[PDB]
Symmetry: D2
Subunit: 115 residues, 4 copies
């Protein structure tokens, strides 16, 4: 798998567990088509979203359902979700990790792309 | 103005100048309708997007065109754009500052919300 | 003033008010000498720490007392304090804004440096 | 080992490799005493700094030598180093990960503390 998502909680200092994550691929008509999805594990990670065969060059969106995460912890959040939009490029490293660090009124996201 | 956007460049330690910003509002049919747009000034700030009257309750998306910014400083960056999606004014009018801190493979965004 | 500190609270989406800040400057003997201190206002900003005359070249440390801040909002936080260490004015006078964004187990800091 | 350090590079979208990291423990006289050190690996991680026996409650400082990292990449940085200061507390989770995300004029740090 060439795509992994990792989510951390800056309030609790913990992995963000059981966060829903939806991946979309941009279609020729510019709409976002569902591509893969899952929930983060006890380590805050979501593995196995896709395969090398399927993750072709294109524009992808990773939506992390942060609002539901915070609400389940009883904490009032700002954002509806965190969205990460990027082009997959075959000239670069093979493995993409999309990481996000969550707070109620702020988030950070980073891409770690490696060979 | 009840909505301001501020953008900083974490490589240079400077305001991010001339960053295009597009704001959308979710319509009754669930589509993202264009709401306002502009670009950051020499201070990295974008003022005057909207008015108290116009910025009603709704779900808003602030799209910050980071790729176009970094396609100009010689950095092929990772992201297409930073998208900030939030419900606004659902407990009455508030003032929102949407801040973003940009690097070529990473960004942070925070909201500062105040009650006038 | 050539040195300003701004602090935001990522839990509340607000300025971080009444945050104590201590600035030190490395002395010739390598010790950290007290240089200036203050606390953030209702805007989350701390102005007036120093002057152009006083803020000479050197290595400075800005200590932001985050634990004491969060020991007041009911959050036992992780860090003791955020420390920001940098060489200043070594190419002539500059204006420095040291910004920090606080969560109980994490913080970000960025510098915005401008030439007057 | 109860203490791990992980460092990422936000400019290159990569682990931050070969970054020097120094850990200190606060002594009774308030000085910082060297405790452990190393360099990050090809994964941006530094493992094996200490042991459960040695990492007793106390105040620790992790200094990450960011200036030298950026200079080796030919990039002009702001900070001398990034400093992370915290109390180790035996009531909490056993394992501490100190993570840092580096840019030339900015850094983020997070603690992930787990059982
Ligand atoms: O979004 C961020 C916004 C700001 C910020 C900094 C100065 C301001 O006058 C302001 O209105 C916002 O500072 C940051 C500082 C950080 O270290 C990380 C961040 O994400 C931000
Ligand atoms: O996105 C972030 C991701 C990570 C991160 C932390 C541990 C990992 O094993 C990893 O693969 C990524 O650490 C951060 C640490 C930060 O201080 C700020 C961030 O945005 C991140
Ligand atoms: Na309402
Ligand atoms: Na000089």
């Amino acid at each position: 798998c060439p795509l992994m998502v990792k989510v951390l909680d800056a309030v609790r200092g913990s992995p963000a567990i059981n966060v829903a994550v939806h991946v979309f691929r941009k279609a020729a008509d510019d709409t976002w088509e569902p591509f893969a999805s899952g929930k983060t594990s006890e380590s805050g990670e979501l593995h196995g979203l896709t395969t090398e065969e399927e993750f072709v060059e294109g524009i992808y969106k990773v939506e992390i359902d942060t609002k539901s995460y915070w609400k389940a912890l009883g904490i009032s959040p700002f954002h509806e979700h965190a969205e990460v939009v990027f082009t997959a490029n075959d000239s670069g490293p093979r493995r993409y990790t999309i990481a996000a660090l969550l707070s109620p009124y702020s988030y950070s996201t980073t891409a770690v792309v490696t060979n």
